[PDB]
Design an enzyme around this catalytic site. Sequence first.
Site, PDB file in Angstrom:
ATOM      1  N   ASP A   1       0.213   4.363   0.998  1.00 55.93           N
ATOM      2  CA  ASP A   1       0.037   5.338   2.097  1.00 55.93           C
ATOM      3  C   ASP A   1       0.846   4.993   3.338  1.00 55.93           C
ATOM      4  O   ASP A   1       0.626   3.952   3.970  1.00 55.93           O
ATOM      5  CB  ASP A   1      -1.453   5.482   2.463  1.00 55.93           C
ATOM      6  CG  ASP A   1      -2.286   6.051   1.316  1.00 55.93           C
ATOM      7  OD1 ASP A   1      -1.719   6.774   0.478  1.00 55.93           O
ATOM      8  OD2 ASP A   1      -3.503   5.779   1.261  1.00 55.93           O
TER       9      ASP A   1
ATOM     10  N   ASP B   1       0.840  -1.186   0.000  1.00 54.50           N
ATOM     11  CA  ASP B   1       0.000   0.000   0.000  1.00 54.50           C
ATOM     12  C   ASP B   1       0.885   1.249   0.000  1.00 54.50           C
ATOM     13  O   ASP B   1       1.810   1.355   0.795  1.00 54.50           O
ATOM     14  CB  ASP B   1      -0.959  -0.010   1.192  1.00 54.50           C
ATOM     15  CG  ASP B   1      -1.968   1.136   1.156  1.00 54.50           C
ATOM     16  OD1 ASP B   1      -1.735   2.141   0.451  1.00 54.50           O
ATOM     17  OD2 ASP B   1      -3.010   1.028   1.842  1.00 54.50           O
TER      18      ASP B   1
ATOM     19  N   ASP C   1       0.433   0.017   6.489  1.00 48.99           N
ATOM     20  CA  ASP C   1       0.713   0.647   7.780  1.00 48.99           C
ATOM     21  C   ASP C   1      -0.473   0.513   8.749  1.00 48.99           C
ATOM     22  O   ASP C   1      -0.481   1.106   9.812  1.00 48.99           O
ATOM     23  CB  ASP C   1       1.100   2.117   7.571  1.00 48.99           C
ATOM     24  CG  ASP C   1      -0.105   3.026   7.345  1.00 48.99           C
ATOM     25  OD1 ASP C   1      -1.135   2.568   6.816  1.00 48.99           O
ATOM     26  OD2 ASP C   1      -0.027   4.215   7.708  1.00 48.99           O
TER      27      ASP C   1
END
EC number: 3.1.3.-
Lengths: 195, 195
Positions: free
Chosen positions: A11, A9, A144
């Site tokens: 982000d 991912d 995260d």
Amino acid sequence: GRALRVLVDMDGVLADVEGGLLRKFRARFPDQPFIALEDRRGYKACEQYGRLRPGLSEKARSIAESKNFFFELEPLPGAVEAVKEMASLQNTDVFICTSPHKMFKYCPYEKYAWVEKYFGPDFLEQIVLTRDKTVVSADLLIDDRPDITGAEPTPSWEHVLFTACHNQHLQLQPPRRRLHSWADDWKAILDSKRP
Amino acid sequence: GRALRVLVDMDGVLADVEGGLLRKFRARFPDQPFIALEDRRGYKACEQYGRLRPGLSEKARSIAESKNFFFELEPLPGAVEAVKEMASLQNTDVFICTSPHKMFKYCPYEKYAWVEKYFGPDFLEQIVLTRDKTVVSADLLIDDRPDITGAEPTPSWEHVLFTACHNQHLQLQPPRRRLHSWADDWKAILDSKRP
């Protein structure tokens, strides 16, 4: 032989969302209190701003919804170099699997443009935008967010937690795994999932 | 019990891409030849325009890349009503699984806005944007493309071909299945994949 498929991912793993939010929040609302990264807890930044002061959730969200928020995010240290190497390894397919959040106006487009900027046009082909990562089949997911969410109770991928300000205080119980940063031994994590 | 997961691609299944392309091509380039829908063959419309006359592939593509092309697409007959019913059935999860094509500027955003317009905000949560559908796990995939492409050789979903001008001349060999339109018995197709 079958390729190892790794989902990453963007982000908080490739693109410094938290630093960008803090930096732009402070510049636009210089007379308001803010959340230093060390004080961030939980992936929902706007909700924490809301707890700091009524109305700040809305202002923090307006920062993330603004044009160029996503596009101007800085790459995290060693992120671009690691993922380029990762994608170049044999028997390894990397997909960037990331959310549009509820911000459809600029976020999707700028995420594509961000990836193209740092990884090239070719890599745009490997992007999957979804709110629900559990419906994507893979061997590993690096993101995260400590909690899994989505329609499939037990996803096919092992979830590996990438350290970020908001999750670093969580002490993971084995066999749950953490990647401390891109300087950490990510190759070992991949290798563990290979035949 | 486990929900039946059905992937539905927007293009040529929910939203009338072919009609929109033809209509806007003709209005913008009134003095050029065009491809009547009955003469369309193969999902790559721009390539067929290129075969009609050198340069027309570029013009057709410029139509699809224009602002509001995707957003102003008309829903196909019975599409919105069928998918709303489908999503309302018990033990059935519907995801819209569709491509950004290589048109990242307006296409992603307008696809989100289109879905919200016809299906509501809630449904935005079920959208997966990907070039590669084979990495998405599901029981069924309904789209208008006869060929499967992507990293997983044998996807988990059965591929069901939705009739469109460009694919209707293909006579599918069993056990490959075709959904002729949304008036056709789609419930029977779903039911066949249930326990």
